[PDB]
Design a protein around this ligand. Structure first.
Ligand code: HEM
Ligand code: HEM
Ligand SMILES: [O]
Ligand SMILES: [O]
Lengths: 153, 153
């Protein structure tokens, strides 16, 4: 649901996070724990942290903050990149070409057929099952954008 | 979703596709158009081709097959890399840490507050709206993985 400009805005502020990932992560976890103490109960390794001051002093709360924001930064970058790639394809296939999801199923079946035909050795039952699932995820991704665009696929 | 091995099987067969992307593209569209002749009617430049032999001689069809498989390969590779990060997070937060979606909402609130507090210049109302949508996409992705695992979240 984000424009390329909106994802640039998300990644722009994320650059500022990366300038001090530990400080940001410490501040996020302390905001979370102080506002919603029930969340701190989920962290058995932080049972010794009672006060804001103990939280601020904690070497491991700060290290965990880095772990959380490092993971979330990677996820946001990869989501921005996927969207910029998928959105125009979904746009053209909904609005210009008007390709039903059934037709995307036909081409998916055609891809599996050609890979089985050309690579029987390296495309056995397990690999064919993997590709079958991956192509269904792709179709589902397109189908979700078709519904956002109001196109009945 | 795919297991880690299933994603690697997809990447491995896609390397074979890329080693002869022209031939794979041709064979995929020929299979689509022969199995499902209604699909050919979408392609102004091809809809006149009757036989596999004619389809194979069409430089236009060959060109298009390469465009299709290039686009799909990028989508598959990006999904594989993204799922490598999201799958294990969802798995640990469902089955080991038992983190409800409403606590990912709490930490999202904290992230948005901390960014606004530290970086007001890079976190105006529009950039805040973008980051709010982006963290909602992250939580919905985790929610969908939670539903797959049967974790109420
Ligand atoms: C932006 C949201 C979040 C991200 C990206 C995130 C990421 C991570 C990562 C990367 C780890 C270490 C690897 C793992 O076990 O999967 C972790 C551990 C953990 N997370 Fe999260 N987390 C998030 C939200 C939460 C919330 C809201 C809670 C609790 C209320 C939580 C509880 C935990 C716990 C208990 C651990 C184990 C920590 C330990 O004992 O070392 N997570 N998290
Ligand atoms: C794996 C599935 C598919 C992929 C990755 C894909 C990719 C593409 C790409 C990259 C283009 C050129 C850029 C664009 O217009 O978006 C395109 C064009 C097109 N696609 Fe698809 N496509 C897929 C499935 C289909 C199917 C199943 C059909 C029809 C049955 C279809 C019909 C078209 C048409 C008619 C065009 C315009 C052709 C032209 O004017 O040159 N696509 N496709
Ligand atoms: O976390
Ligand atoms: O296509």
């Amino acid at each position: 649901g984000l424009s390329d400009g909106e994802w640039q805005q998300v990644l722009n502020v994320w650059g500022k996070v990366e300038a001090d990932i530990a400080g940001h992560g410490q501040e996020v976890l302390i905001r979370l724990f102080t506002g919603h103490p029930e969340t701190l109960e989920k962290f058995d390794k932080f049972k010794h942290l009672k006060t804001e001051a103990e939280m601020k002093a904690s070497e491991d709360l700060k290290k965990h903050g880095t772990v959380v924001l490092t993971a979330l930064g990677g996820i946001l970058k990869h989501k921005a990149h996927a969207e910029a790639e998928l959105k125009p394809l979904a746009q053209s296939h909904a609005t210009k070409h008007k390709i039903p999801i059934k037709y995307l199923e036909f081409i998916s079946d055609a891809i599996i057929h050609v890979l089985h035909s050309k690579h029987p050795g390296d495309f056995g039952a397990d690999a064919q099952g993997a590709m079958t699932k991956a192509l269904e995820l792709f179709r589902n991704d397109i189908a979700a954008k078709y519904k956002e665009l109001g196109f009945q696929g």
